[PDB]
Subunit: 237 residues, 4 copies
Amino acid sequence: TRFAEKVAIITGSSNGIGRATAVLFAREGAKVTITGRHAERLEETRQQILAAGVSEQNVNSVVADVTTDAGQDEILSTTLGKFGKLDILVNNAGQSIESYDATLNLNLRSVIALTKKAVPHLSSTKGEIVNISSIASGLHATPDFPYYSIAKAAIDQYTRNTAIDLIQHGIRVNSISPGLVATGFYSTMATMKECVPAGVMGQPQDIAEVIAFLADRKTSSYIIGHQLVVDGGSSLI
Amino acid sequence: TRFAEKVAIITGSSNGIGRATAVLFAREGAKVTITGRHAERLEETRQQILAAGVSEQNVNSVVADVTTDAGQDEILSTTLGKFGKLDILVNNAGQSIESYDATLNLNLRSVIALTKKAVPHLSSTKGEIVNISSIASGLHATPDFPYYSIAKAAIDQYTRNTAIDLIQHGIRVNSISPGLVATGFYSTMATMKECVPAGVMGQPQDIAEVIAFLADRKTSSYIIGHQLVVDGGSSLI
Amino acid sequence: TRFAEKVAIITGSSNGIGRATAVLFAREGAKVTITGRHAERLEETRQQILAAGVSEQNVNSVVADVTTDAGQDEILSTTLGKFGKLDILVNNAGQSIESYDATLNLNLRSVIALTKKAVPHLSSTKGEIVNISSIASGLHATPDFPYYSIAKAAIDQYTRNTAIDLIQHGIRVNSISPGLVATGFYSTMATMKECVPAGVMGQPQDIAEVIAFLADRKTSSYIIGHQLVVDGGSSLI
Amino acid sequence: TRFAEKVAIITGSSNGIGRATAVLFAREGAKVTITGRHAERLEETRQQILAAGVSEQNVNSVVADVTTDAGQDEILSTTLGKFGKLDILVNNAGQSIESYDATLNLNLRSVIALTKKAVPHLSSTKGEIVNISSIASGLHATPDFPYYSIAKAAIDQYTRNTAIDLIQHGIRVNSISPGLVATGFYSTMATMKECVPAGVMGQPQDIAEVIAFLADRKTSSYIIGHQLVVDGGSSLI
C-alpha cells in the first residue's frame, strides 16, 4: 500500500481529523507518530490503529505540549529514534488579547517552530508537509472565530511561502481548508442541508483521504503550495 | 479498481492531458468515450488504451466537432448507446475578435452546451464533472494568452456556479488548473528550474491522477466546486 | 475641478450606474459621450447633466448598439469629432445557450471590441479604462445569474490582462465590482439589513464616486489592474 | 476640505506612508495624532505638517511603543483629551522564532489591541478604520519576508472580520496592500521598469491618497472590508 516504508508525524491526532488521518496512514503501511496533551484521547487513537490490524511497532505515541520547545523536540526525537527517519508531517495543531495569544501560539507559532525543526529530516527523504487550515480563512469574513481565522489565514500564507522555499530542498508543501466536519432534529437537518451544499456533514475520514492524496507523490507530485478547500461547497455560498 | 462499472466521457482526449486521462481511467476499469476532430490522433489514444491491456469493448471513439450541436449529441448518444449510462464527464476541450470568437466557442460555449446535455444522465448516476481550466486564469495577468485566459476564468466561475446548482441533483463538480505540462539545452533547463518551483516539467499523467482523484468519491467526496491548481508552484511566483 | 479638459466615454449610461457616472464626470468638468440603445432613456441622462448646470456642448449623445461594429465606430467617431480626443473609457455595458450568446456578446465581446478601438486614442492621452464588473464574479457561486457571472469573471481576467499590456502604452486599467445598487416593507427592510452589512442599499452615485477615483491619476495613479469591490460588504458574508 | 472637524490617529507616522498620510489629512483639515518610538523622526513629520501651513493646534505628537498597553493608552488618551473625539484610525504599524514573535507582535497583536481600544470611540462618530497591509500578503509566495507576509495575511483576514462585525456599530473598515514604495543606475532603472508595470516607483503620497479615499465616506461609503491593492501592478506579474 502507499506510504509503505514512510514515516509520518501527525499532530493534533488525539481526535477527529488528526485521529482519522493517523488510522488511514497506518492502515496504508506508514510508521506513524501520534501526539497530543490528553494521553487518554491519544491512546484511543492508538487503539483504533491496533484494531485496524496494524502492528503496535508502527505507532509512536507522544504525550506533549506542541507549543513548547521540549514537546516539539520530544515529538521529533522519538520519531527519529524509533523509525530512523521522517517522510511526512501533517501539521494539524489547533475576544481578549489573551485568547489571541493562546490561539496564535497554538495555531501558528507551534506549527512554524515544529516545521523548522522537521525540515532537515524532510529534506533527506524529499518529504511532504500538509498544513491543516480552515475555511475560516478565505476571501470572506469569519466573525464567530476572530483569532482562529486570522491564524489560519497566516497558515495559508505560510504554506505558500514555505512551499516555494522548501521545494528547493525536495520538500512538497500544501494545505487543506476543511469546512464543517463532525463525527470526530428535523430543523437541524434542514439547516444543515441549507448550509452545506453537499447535503451531508463532512467526516474526519473525508479530510484524511485528502491529506493522504497530498502526502502521496504518486497522486499529487505536481501540486505545490496549494490551499485545497474541502468543505462540501460551504465557502462558495 | 476504482471506476469499475463507471462510464466516463473525456473530451479533448486525442492528446496530452485528455489522452493520459483516458488511459488512466480505462486502466482503472472505467468504460471510456474518447473524442476529438483528428481521427488519427484519437486512434492513437485508443491504441495506448489497448496496449495497456484494456478490452476494446471498453472504448468508444467519437470523431466529432464538440463545438457543434451534432458533435455534442453524437458524443453523448454513442456513449449511452454502447455503455447504457454516464458517470463522469471530464471537460477538457481547448488578437482579433475572430480569434476571440473561436477561442470562447471552444473553451466555454461548447463546454456549457455539452454539460447541459449530460446533466440529466449524470444526475441519474450521481456522477462527477471535472472541468479542465488553466493557471492562465487566476488573480494575475496572462497577456500572452488574452482570450484563452478569460475563457478559462469564465470556466472557473462556471465551475463554482454549477457545483452549487448541480449538487442538488447528486452531481459533484470541480475544476483543475494545470500549469506547464509537456510530453503529451542547459539554458532552457536553467530557465525551467527558474519558472517551475517543482524543478521538473509537469506531465500529462500528473494531471490525470488529479482528475481521477476528483472523479472518485471514495477519495474526494467532500470536495465541491473547488479550483484545484496543479502547476508545480508556478502561479505562486 | 478634476477631469477638466478630459474627455470620457461612458457606455450603458442611459440608466443607473452609467447615468450617475456621466452626471458626476460632467459636473467635474469632463466632456462626456453617453450612449445606449434607448434614445428616451439616454436623453433623460442628458437632461440631468444639463440640469446640473453643465453646458450642452460638453455632452455627446450617441444612440447605438454597442454590440455592433457600426455602433462602436459611431460611439468613438463622434467623440473624437466633437471633442478631438479621448481620455477615459468607462466600460459599463450590460438557461439556454441563446441567452448565453446574447449575454456574453454584450458583457464581454462588445467591451473587448470597443476597447481595442479606443486603445490608440487612450495611448495618446495616457488615458484610463474603468471596467464595470459585478460581485456576481468572485470566489463563490452565483447560480441566479449563470451567464452574467461568468461573463463578468472574464471581465475581471480581461481587466488584469489589459492592465499589464496597456500600461506599457501609458494607459491605466482597473475594474469595479458593484454589489447591490438601487435608485437608478418591514420584512424587506429586515432582509436588506441582513444581506447588506452596510445596512443601506448601494446607490448609483456611490459607484460613480469610485469610478471617478479610478479615472483620476491624482487620486489613484499607482492602482493598476485591481478589481475594486464596492458592495457594502455583501460578498464577505 | 474633507476631514474638516474629523480627528485621526495615524500609527507608524514617523516616516514614509504614515508621514505622508498625516501631512495629507492635516492639509485636509483633520486634527491628527501622529505617533512613533523615534521622537526625532516624529518631530520631522510634525514639521512637514506645520510647513504645509497647518496650525500646531491640529497636531498631537505621541512618542510611544504601540506594542505596549501603556503606549496604546497614551496614544488614545492624548487624542481624546486634546481633540475630544476620534473619527479615523489608520493602522500603519510595521528566520528565528524570536523574529517571528517580534514581527507578529508589532504587525498584528498591537493593531488588534489598539483597535479594540479605539472601537468605542469610533462607534460614537461612525468612524473609519484603514488597515495598512502589503502585497507581501496575497495568493502567491513571499519567501523574502517570511513572517512579515503571514502577519499581513492575518491583517487582511482581520480586516474582513472586523469590517463585518464593526459595521453594525457604524464603523467602516477597509485595508490597503501597497506594493513597492520609495521616497519616504541604468541597470536598476531597467529592473524597476521590469518589476513594476507602472514603470514608476510608488510614492508615499500615492498610498496616502488611497487612505484618504477610504477614510472619506463621501467618496467610498459603500466600500466595506475590501483589500485595496496599490502596487503599480506588481502582484499581477
